RNA sequence: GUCAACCGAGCGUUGAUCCGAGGAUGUCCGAAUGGGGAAACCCGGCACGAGUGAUGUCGUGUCACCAGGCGCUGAAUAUAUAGGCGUCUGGGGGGAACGCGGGGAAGUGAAACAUCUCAGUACCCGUAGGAAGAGAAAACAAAAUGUGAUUCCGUGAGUAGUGGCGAGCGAAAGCGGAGGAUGGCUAAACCGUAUGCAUGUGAUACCGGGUAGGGGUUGUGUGUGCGGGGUUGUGGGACCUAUCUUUCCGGCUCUACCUGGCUGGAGGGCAGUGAGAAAAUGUUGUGGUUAGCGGAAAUGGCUUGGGAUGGCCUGCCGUAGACGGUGAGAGCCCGGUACGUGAAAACCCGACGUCUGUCUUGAUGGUGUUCCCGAGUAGCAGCGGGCCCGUGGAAUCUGCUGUGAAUCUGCCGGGACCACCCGGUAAGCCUGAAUACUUCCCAGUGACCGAUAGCGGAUUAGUACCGUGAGGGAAUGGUGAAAAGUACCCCG
RNA sequence: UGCAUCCGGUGAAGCCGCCGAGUGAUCGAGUGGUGGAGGGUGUGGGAGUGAGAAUGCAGGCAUGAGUAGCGAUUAGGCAAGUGAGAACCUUGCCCGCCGAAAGACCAAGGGUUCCUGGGCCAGGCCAGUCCGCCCAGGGUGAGUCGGGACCUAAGGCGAGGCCG
RNA sequence: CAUAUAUCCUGAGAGGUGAUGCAUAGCCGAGUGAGGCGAAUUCGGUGAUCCUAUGCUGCCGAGAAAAGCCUCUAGCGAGGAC
């Protein structure tokens, strides 16, 4: 749960950090997903949403 | 043909004749030759394909103004 | 920027009874993205459970075409990759079975 | 999201779903463009970075082709060039019609048919633009004291005419109108210039006379590129030469001095993104477009009916009785209309102030003669196209060859031609508005269709199916007010 | 459709009718059944304005007809089986056929037809518990195999280029 | 200097290993089908359209190219070769 003005407080490396963070869950998700041992679905959504903000952010720190 | 070169003297097309007509074209050419110049501005010989009126222009005229001339037109001479 | 991730290429596993004899002797099927190659499976793969392949394996896969009111469709195509682990054996946690 | 339900798991007043404008990401093929290729799939280089004990691998970029400019070299070969290497900018293809230039048929009609016509249509090519092209008189006209760029519409006119005088084709002038910009910019004579191919009065000449140092502002030539001057028809213009001579000075006229003529700045004026030079600037208008929003008045009464929006009887609103839907025809239920509102951002109009130039060192007229007024062209001859005009007595406009002139007592036209008069001043260039058109978008209208109709396509539609291929090319709408879609039992 | 008026969920149209009418094309504001929302009248206007024939078009249905055929020249059978249902499906023992093929392996080509589980309103020229049919799920693993990263012929494309 | 069965090259195959293995006849009960032990494994004939053979012989119709392999230098050359 993140929002982008919180993330525009994070520097590069912070960021880079929670987007390593954020596709290692994706991955053991998509494992829990076939597996059967996951429920809440939505948490790829919301994963993969996060996951854009945070390239996003970069390429506007990166035009700025 | 590979078109004039100093003028543009291209060719027409014309048709029917006497004795009862028939209706048939003939291209009108325009009489281009291969004739050869030289340049004593750049010591050069140039070949170009100009009919005999562009030759009259030419002794008439010069060569170095008639290469200006195409220059304009940017003929890839 | 673009971060090259090796998780982004491992999709998922493979679970059936043809994966199930296999892992029983520790070889383990995962799904990949078309575009991968054996040497880049490799690394992802003993980068991310830090234990020690020698020898992976590809296949490919047409997809069906089923039938509808509408018409002829057809699944999508795959790319499964089969890996044997060597003796180091420490089995891949993460799958759940 | 949906045909299209079902299940699961969630989010949301901290403002979701939804709508609008701008950005980001943007796999592979495709002009496709690193090389290659059976389109969407195979192989690489170079710089950097990530990664392995090293290789392999991975990521980010970039590398095609030509045209032009600039830069380095100048092969045979001497000048030097083509070419080679690097860099910078362009172009490359798609499109529904509309346009301009070029090419360019035939079936048909002629009761046959070739000339003719169909048609300079279809089609093909090359290039465009939001419109295009044409466009400022080398024009019309007829002695009227006329008109005054062009284009598109109405008429003249199915006429004068043309035509195997057969089929058939077919103007223009003139007149009324729309729109108005009766518009601008150049070359040449002549100077000042950098030059560049040449030479040497090597001197009485380069300049305002003259007082003059030099001893060449090269002395004289000749084209080139730049800058002035000059843009016309009743002819004008450059030299010449008087007159009034509508700003201050800096330096210049080779030079100190009197003048004439330049090279600078300054108030100023004019104009401006104009066709007439070109870029950005910041204010900027409730100016316009790109989401939307409010919005008047009956649970009215009796009856029918499953349901009243019906009938009958009572009220109301109305800058709103257009339309549609709602369980049966609804101004007063809903959606919305008349009407008024509304834009942070982007886009378009002008508006401005920047910014840019531009005339200002000036003009009106005089006066007698030399010079210039767009050259392989106009003209003439030979074959041809198209003009009402089919080679005819056949002008004007033109295409290829061959020949080939002058500059104002010049030249071209006024339907052969000649003399007179008239009009106009070609061979350099730009020019808006009226006009034509709709792939797409927005809002509406219909004495148009209403599922064998209407777009081929209300239904998966250029789909299925057919064909090797170009290419052809279908069929199928309706439950009911709402699924309340027959739980349960019996035969099977 | 313009205009004026009339009927209509207290049941219009449309359809099946009965009874009747008009000199005819035709008519019933004359009534019944079905059915469920628009229609009639008079005057004018305008037409995609009247079909029985085009070896006419599209769809549906008849006669032929419950007839011909049911796709080779190898040939099937008995018991048991599950099953609602067995000439054909599974197994057992016989029998018979090909045996330089009617056997085993590749290339082109096709594209899940392969295995398992379930299924039989469509299909198979009969029926069917069966099937290449239907549905879901599963399944194809290459340093050495056939190709590419190695090369070239026929021929193709073709920078520059020449012609047009 | 040379004619030798010298010397070299190429080369079907026989032989040893490969193979203390595998696998096979069969037996056992076992019943879906699981299974487990598993003997001898010599000698002759016959005979390929297959191999040496891109060989050999003969004839005329006179019989793909390039890569690859080996080699000589140009050159990169103080480090590396096996």
Redesign the interface.
């Known amino acids: 749960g993140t929002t982008p003005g919180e993330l525009r407080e994070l520097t590069d490396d912070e960021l ?1 950090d929670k ?2 963070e954020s ?2 869950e ?3 998700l ?6 059967g ?1 996951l429920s809440n679905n939505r948490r790829l959504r919301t994963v993969r949403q996060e996951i854009a903000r945070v ?1 996003t952010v ?2 506007e720190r ?1 035009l700025g | 043909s590979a078109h004039c070169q100093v003028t543009g003297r291209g060719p027409g097309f014309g048709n029917s004749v006497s004795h009862s007509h028939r209706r048939t074209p003939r291209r009108w050419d325009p009489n281009i030759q291969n004739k050869t110049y030289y340049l004593p501005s750049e010591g050069r010989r140039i070949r170009l394909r100009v009919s005999a009126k562009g030759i009259k222009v030419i002794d008439r005229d010069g060569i170095e103004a008639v290469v200006a001339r195409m220059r304009a037109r940017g003929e890839k001479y | 920027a673009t971060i090259t991730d090796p998780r982004d290429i491992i999709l998922a596993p493979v679970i059936s009874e043809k994966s199930y004899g296999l892992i029983e002797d520790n070889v383990y099927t995962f799904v990949v993205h078309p575009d991968s190659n054996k040497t880049q499976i490799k690394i992802a793969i003993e980068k991310i459970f830090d234990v020690k392949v020698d020898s992976v394996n590809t296949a490919n896969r047409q997809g069906k075409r089923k039938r509808t009111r509408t018409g002829f469709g057809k699944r999508k195509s795959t790319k499964r990759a089969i890996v044997k682990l060597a003796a180091g054996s420490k089995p891949i946690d993460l799958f759940g079975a």
């Open positions: 880079k987007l390593r596709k290692e994706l991955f053991n998509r494992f829990q997903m076939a597996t041992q390239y970069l390429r990166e």
